[model samples]
Target: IEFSEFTVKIKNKNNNWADLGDLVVRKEEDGIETGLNVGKGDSDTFAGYTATFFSLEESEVNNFIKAMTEGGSFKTSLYYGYKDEQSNANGIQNKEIITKIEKIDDFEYITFLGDKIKDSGDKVVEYAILLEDLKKNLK
Candidate 1:
């Protein structure tokens, strides 16, 4: 839902952008769908993103920052939370953490999650101790 006004590129699990031939949109059973046809197999895939996060409250920021700054992978509660049936289904796990940070007019910091936090080399988010997402989500 973030960049709906224009074309977007998606980085796949293999860490490569998928090339769906042409940007085309059409009506589907429920609503208008946007996707591109893969010329080889005549298949279609949507150009979009899925993000994962760790709640600041759920996290102890010191260790999270250490993991990011120190060059290592750490366990996180983001994936651990949603895996629970009690959570209101916040979102899916794997899930990338914020990618960018910006200071708004009111001095509010806004961060964007580009890809899921990985345990190095494209591993998905898992449960355990406190941790953080990597800079690029890949090795």
Candidate 2:
């Protein structure tokens, strides 16, 4: 499968500068594979994945990002706890992690860009799983 290349620009709500980047979605036998890619000049990054019901359109991409930020939910939990004893050890717990999506451009071919980290930690989250869910649900 191959993906079409598009560009999107996001602005810092607090600032006026526009952040520019690209959207890459793969064309599969079943549907369009949606994914995000952004960069600052030489440094570029990838975003989560989603499935597109139809051919990729700028408006739909924009809406998708908007929905992700406005409707997106998060969860966080301890995959592993710090204790050993059942009473002392917390073990693995599940928790909600917060995240938001944002659109960087209104006219750009790209669709969305924003932060994905739930906390100050260096960990970054991806949306491949979410995309799979969308594929199953939409199909």
Candidate 3:
């Protein structure tokens, strides 16, 4: 599948900003994947939003993963569970939160990964996206 457009926004604890240009991801039926080109920018902050999309296809999951991992960094942490149990987030019990990369083939997903600001009055960090629906709309 081909993405019509993709974007990522990053903000650091100091409110510094980095905007990642279009990221592309393509995957074949055999799981051979390609494409994750990110345009350049610099932001040292840690909290912000990210939005990305592509043309709809059954194999979107692989494409999503490929895009997310490309030119991106991950931090490690130990915290888990539904931010609100009533939401049945992930339907998992006693979840231990570890920093990770994930992809879902559903309509779309969004969440606040951590506090939006730090003790020094800095941003905390977050990521979100509308996947399947955006892909469909691209059609």
Candidate 4:
């Protein structure tokens, strides 16, 4: 099927450089601030660039994913929130978590209030090694 134009956020953190992975910038219309990863999520950020496609078709997603399967990595821009320490104490989503995808598995996720991990035994994101490495990365 002909898919709409999607996008992937390529986070170039760590010394890995472009050798890391990219996240499918699809699904929600939410956002990010470059969030240059100087290190891990629990660490600081350095210099990084995000590679995004103006038209990321499913075929493109599939092939790109399949191309990096097995031992490669896949990145996902997971949305997260924090207390509005700026003006109001109201909760808000001001941070974008760019978690690295190393391996995949059965444990998929859905972000309702936050990033929630659940077992989708019957439904798993296709792309054999893509999903497998995703699962591994999650775990």
Q: How close is every model to the real structure, measured as TM-score? A: 0.25, 0.25, 0.25, 0.21
lDDT of 1 by residue, 53-129 (tens): 23322233443344433433333334322222222145333333333333333432213323334334444322211
User: For model 2, how does the per-residue alpha-carbon lDDT over 1-139 read when each residue is reduced to its tens digit?
Assistant: 2233332222222134443233343444533333334343332333332222113233244343334334443222222211111211232233332334323343222112222233335433222113322233333
User: Deviation in angstroms for 77 in model 1?
Assistant: 2.7
Clashes per candidate, residues 3 or more apart or on different chains? 8, 12, 10, 14
Q: What is the lDDT, from 0 to 100, of the residue 99 in candidate 1?
A: 31
Give lDDT tens digits, candidate 3, residues 2-98.
5434333221112322333333333445332222234344485322322222222343344334344332322212122112222122232222222
lDDT of 4 by residue, 1-139 (tens): 2322232223221122232334433322232121211223423332243322222233234433333332332232322211111211222233222222342234322211122223323321211113343334332
For candidate 3, the lDDT comes to: 0.31
Q: Model 1 — which ten-residue stretch has the worst lDDT?
A: 130-139
Ranking by lDDT: 3, 2, 1, 4
Alpha-carbon runs more than 4 Å astray in model 3: 1-18, 32-34, 40-126, 130-133, 137-139
Candidate 4 off by > 4 Å: 1-36, 39-55, 71-139
Best by lDDT: 3
- Ten contiguous residues minimizing lDDT sum, candidate 3: 76-85
RMSD of 1: 14.4
